[PDB]
Structure formats: C-alpha cells, structure tokens
Design a protein around this ligand. Structure first.
Ligand code: ATP
Ligand code: ADP
Ligand code: MG
Lengths: 89, 351, 250
C-alpha cells in the first residue's frame, strides 16, 4: 500500500512486473508471513518476476522445490527503505 | 444330529479354546459358565442366553496374531506404486515398520491425518493394509450419535450385542486388525450423550489395554491394534480427545506433478473405466497442461478426474455412434469437448 | 411331517436364497442364524426378532439385474416424446448409454441437476427410467434431520427397522434401480444429527461399494445404482457433499 501511495505521489508508474507482499510495523521493518507456497505459485502463474519478501522467511523460501523457484529473483529486505529504492531505481 | 445336550455344546467350546493362548483371567469366568450350563436345563430362555453369550466369548481370538511383513523395500514399493507423493505418510509408515522390526514383537500406535477434502486421505489406507499385511476394516462414524453402537448393551436386555468393535475383531480373526475410524470431524453431538465421550476410553495409548465393553464385561486388551483417523480440519474435534492422537498434515498438490500423477494413474484409470484404447482415445500431454492451467486450479484431485472422464466420454460417444473412428484431442478441439474456459489469464493491467 | 414344522420356516428362507446369487460373505451368516433360530423357543421375543431379521436378509436381491435397452434411436424416441429442448441432459444421458455399451456390464454413476423450480426436473427422471428400462423410485429428504432413517438402528431397539434404502431395494427387487433423492438443497442441517455427514458414505463413488447400515450389518454394494439429485441452487449444498457429484445445469 505504501508503495502504491508513493507511486501516486511522484506519479511514476511502479516498475513493470514487480509484485510484493509482507507486513510493515510503522518504521519500515518488514515482518514474516505464512503460506509462502501459495503466493509463490501464484506469482509464478502471473508471470511477475521480481518478488520481494521479508528476510525472516528466507529459510522457508528455500524449502520449496527448485523448479517452483525457477526464474524469479527474490530480494529479501528488512527495512522498508530498500524496497523504496527498488521500486524506484 | 442329536448332540444338542451338554455332551457337545460344552465340548466344542472347551476344545475350541485349546489352540488359543488365552489370558488366565477369562478362563475362570468361562469355567463357571460351563458348569452352570451343565446344571441348567437344555431348554429355557436362560439357557439359550447363557449359551449365546458363551459363544460370543469363545469366538474372540486370544493371542492369535496376524503375521506381519518386515521387509522394507518390498513394503515401500507397494506403498509407493499406487499413489504419487504424499511423502509424509509414506515416510512415517516406513519408520513405523522400522521400529517394529527392531524390537521384535508387534506394536500399535494411534494417529491421524488432515487436509483439504479429496486429497486421497482414505484411498491410501487400504494400500497400507496390503503393505503391512494387517487385515483391513473400516467403519464410518460420521453422523453417528448412539454411543451404544461402540459399547454394546448390558446383555440382560433383549437384543444386546457387543459394540461394533467386537464385531470387527471377530470378523478378522487376527487380534491386530488395522481398524480405520473415518471422518471423526462430523460426529454427532448435542442431542444425546456424545459418543466422543466414550471414544476416549478406546484411544488412550496405554489404558486401552484393559478395555471393558458392557456386553462381555471381561477386559479386552487390544493395545496392538493400529488405529487411524481422518478429519479434514483439525479444529472441531474436542480438545481432550484431540490431544491424544498425533496429527500428520497432508498438503495440496502442485500442478507440475498433479500432471505426472494424472498422467500415470488417472488417465489409465479413466481409460480402463470407459473401455477405450490408446488408439481410439489418444490424448497429448500438452492438452493436459492446458486443461490443468485453465479449467481446474485446486488442491483436490476430484476435479481433474471429472474433467478427464468428461473429455473421454464425449470422445466415446463420438466413436460408438458418431462418425470418427479415432477421436484425436488437440487443444483446438478442447473447447468443443469440455465447453468453455472458466479461468482466463486475468491481468487487470499488464502495464 | 405335517402340522407346520419349524423347518418349513427355515426352508422357505432357504428356497428364497437358493436362486439369487448371494456373495459368499453373507452366505455363512444366514446359516448360523438359521441353526440358532431353530433351537430357540418360539414364544421368545428373541425368536420373533431373529426370524424377522432373517426374513429381511433373504429378501434383498443379490445380483438380480434388470436388463437394459441400448439402441440409441429408441433413446431419442422416448426422450423427445415427452420433453422439449434442454438438450444438455439429453446429450449427457446419451453419452451414458454409449459408454455403458462399450464395456459390457451395467454401471452406476452420480449426477446432479439444478435450475429454476418447476422446469420438469422431476418428470424427466421418470422418462429416463422408461428409456434405460431401469426401475424408478422417488425419495425426498427436504428438511430431514433424523439421520437414523438412512441407516436404521442397532436391531436391539424396539421399533428398529433397516434404513430406507434397503426397503427400496426390497421393493424394486433389482440390484441397480434409479434412486431419485430429491431436494437436497433444503436438507435439514441442525444439532439433531445432520444427514449430510451420513450421505457422504453413500455418495462417495469409490467407498460406497461396501455400504452398511446398522440393522443388518453386512455390507451392501450400491456400485451399479445411478443416483440423481436436484437442487434449486448450488450454494446452500454443504461443500464436501457438493464436491462428489457432477453438476448439470438445466
Ligand atoms: N495421490 C493419489 N494417488 C492416487 N489417487 C488419489 C491420490 N489423491 C487422491 N486420489 C483419488 O481421490 C479419490 C478419493 O480420495 P480420498 O477420498 O482419499 O480423498 P479424501 O481427502 O479422503 O476425501 P474424503 O476424506 O472426503 O473422501 C480416490 O479415487 C483416489 O484415486
Ligand atoms: N420443456 C418441457 N417439457 C416437458 N414438460 C415440461 C417442460 N417444461 C415444463 N414441463 C412441465 O413442468 C412440470 C414441472 O414438474 P417438476 O419436474 O416437478 O418441476 P420441478 O421438478 O422443476 O419442480 C412437469 O409436469 C412438466 O411436464
Ligand atoms: Mg476419504
């Protein structure tokens, strides 16, 4: 949502084909979230290719089958600002 | 056939006892019943009742034990060959046979499964029963409410017979059947006494070894049995009961291997069901990929089965009565066969 | 020996069993029940119950198979005689006769109909029964909440009778009738015992083959039956039960 708002602010479209998720706790800290397999397969199904996830779920992202994780560049992050750099290169 | 007195009615029982290795406990009871039957008249309702109850005692195996398989790979093969994946259970049962093989004598444990309906939670049971070599038995409990069904009656009533479990334990002569309680989630409640409140007495891992059914009051050890339970959501079960039995989470399938199961079992299943041939009813893998990623997205497997059989059966009618001598599904044909796409490439904004 | 011997009652059961081919499994149970039944004193209620039970058990057809018509032109004729349009159901049942004819032996199946009320969903069932030549037999469950009706009782209760489905198999005297469970959409769903959790043991195609109800414990085999079900709208049907059954839409 914050990235959405920011895109409205600058008016820059968000970078094409860049999904993202995770929770944020009022100071840019990212937080873990469950259910990773469903989001993984869905993002793969939609063709989006720059998913960014909380660092805390790193382990859980790597427990998935290699073929499922083929072709999409995870960028783990802990403080929200890095995502702000990424959405707006 | 005039041997209807104490000469043969008590002989056949006492000799039938011989080969079993009965616990010394119940032999006393059986002896008083024999002598009391000896003093009883051959014709009276008391006589037939006592004789009937004695027959129910003598029928029960005491220490007969079905021989169990112990080879692993021969077990693992047959456990594997008729289902894909569901790795957890195929790993768990294998560990179980390992522990049983290590410490000599046979053993039993109680466990449960849970996942979205239709994942195959119930099909696997019978395959397991053919692997371990335990005799199979099932009895759906869902929607039952009569506790007496699983505990019998007092034997002084008219039609009292022991609860269902003793029927199971006589029907399979071994003392260690693979009982399979089913659909525990949907037991009745709240209009009479909950059968669940009785179930605890069975399922205590240790205490069950002196189970005491109301009909035949003598305690019946049955610790060696291997219970199983199957609920699709592990919340409705009341907590005190839910604690006893370890859970094992089956998980919904991913498409890439939902393909490879359907391409090995389901397709041959449906083709054998409809009686067609690979010549008459060829289907490419690619149409299966399309069908999977278009018309059916879900964790279950019932849905893909329904689509596959529908496609085949439309081809079958097109053959036996229609015009083509060999239907040949191609993606272009698919709309004709299945109907119309349901899911599409939803992307509100590609830019 | 005249004067109504008890062996006459035995034998009328036996003769009733001699023709129809029972599975070997239940072939024994009747034997021990008979041998016990003779020894009973006749005035005992136990004798009444056991004899009534044995009668109930011999009554079930075992492998009686009503023969099926299969010529397709006849199917078209008897369908178009009494229902216009609604071609979907027509084509589906025609595909049924096709696949059944490719594999010899008679087969069962589950289906579901749904659409606006009063389109004739009930009448077409009877027309289909006259088309395939199976017997017909309706059975409503709108609002039902006594689950025991579908599965009888322990046989020691007074007032116990085997659940309905055994009564209908006794009535149609045929292994493969065409049940018409009706108005599943309105089926009772309360604290009193939800039938919807007991129907699943019937409707699941794979495991129904050894269905058993508590009165006469021995499993029955429903695999050749062709269920049909009706509903004004899908949404209220409880989900697991909805999942089993194919869904035509008139
Ligand atoms: N891995 C699998 N291998 C083979 N068959 C499968 C598999 N998974 C599901 N099935 C098919 O699903 C059908 C029924 O599966 P099953 O009934 O075990 O699912 P379920 O979760 O038990 O649903 P429910 O408990 O409601 O019946 C079977 O016909 C079976 O072939
Ligand atoms: N196209 C049609 N062909 C034949 N009969 C029809 C048609 N449309 C309506 N009917 C009549 O509508 C009536 C509705 O009966 P019923 O099947 O009980 O409706 P529903 O089952 O939908 O409540 C039937 O008696 C039937 O003859
Ligand atoms: Mg099941």
């Amino acid at each position: 949502i914050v990235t959405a708002l920011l895109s409205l602010a600058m008016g820059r479209p968000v970078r094409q084909n860049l999904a993202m998720t995770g929770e944020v706790s009022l100071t840019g800290k990212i937080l873990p979230v469950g259910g990773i397999k469903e989001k993984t397969i869905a993002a793969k199904r939609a063709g989006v290719t720059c998913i960014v996830l909380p660092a805390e779920n790193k382990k859980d992202f790597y427990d998935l089958a290699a073929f499922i994780t083929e072709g999409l560049e995870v960028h783990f992050v802990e403080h929200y600002r890095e995502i702000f750099d990424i959405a707006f290169p | 056939l005039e041997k209807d007195d104490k000469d043969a009615i008590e002989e056949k029982f006492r000799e039938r006892l011989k080969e079993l290795v009965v616990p010394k406990h119940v032999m006393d009871v059986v002896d008083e019943e024999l002598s009391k039957l000896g003093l009883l008249d051959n014709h009276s309702s008391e006589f037939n009742v006592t004789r009937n109850y004695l027959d129910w005692l003598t029928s029960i195996p005491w220490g007969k034990y079905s021989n169990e398989n112990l080879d692993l790979a021969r077990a693992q093969a047959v456990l594997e060959e008729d289902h894909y994946g569901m790795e957890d259970v195929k790993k768990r049962i294998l560990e179980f046979i390992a522990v049983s093989q290590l410490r000599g004598s046979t053993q039993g444990k109680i466990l449960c499964f849970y996942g979205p309906p239709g994942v195959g939670k119930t099909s696997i049971a019978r395959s397991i029963a053919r692997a371990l070599n335990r005799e199979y038995f099932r009895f759906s409990v869902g929607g039952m409410t009569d506790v007496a069904e699983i505990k019998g009656h007092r034997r002084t009533y008219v039609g009292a017979m022991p609860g269902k479990i003793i029927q199971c334990l006589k029907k399979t002569k071994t003392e260690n059947p693979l009982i399979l309680i089913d659909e525990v989630d949907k037991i009745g409640r709240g209009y009479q006494g909950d059968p669940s409140s009785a179930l605890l007495e069975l399922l205590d891992p240790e205490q069950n070894a002196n189970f005491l059914d109301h009909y035949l009051d003598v305690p019946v050890d049955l610790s060696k049995v291997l219970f199983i339970c199957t609920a699709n959501v592990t919340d409705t079960i009341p907590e005190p009961l839910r604690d006893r039995m370890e859970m094992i989470n089956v998980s919904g399938y991913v498409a890439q291997e939902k393909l490879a199961i359907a391409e090995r079992y389901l397709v041959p299943q449906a083709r054998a069901l409809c009686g067609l041939d690979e010549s008459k009813a060829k289907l490419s893998s690619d149409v299966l990929t399309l069908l999977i990623k278009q018309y059916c997205r879900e964790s279950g497997v019932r849905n893909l089965q329904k689509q596959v059989e529908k496609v085949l059966r439309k081809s079958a009618y097109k053959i036996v009565s229609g015009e083509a001598e060999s239907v040949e599904v191609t993606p272009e044909n698919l709309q004709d066969f299945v109907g119309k796409p349901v899911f599409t490439v939803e992307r509100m904004y590609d830019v």
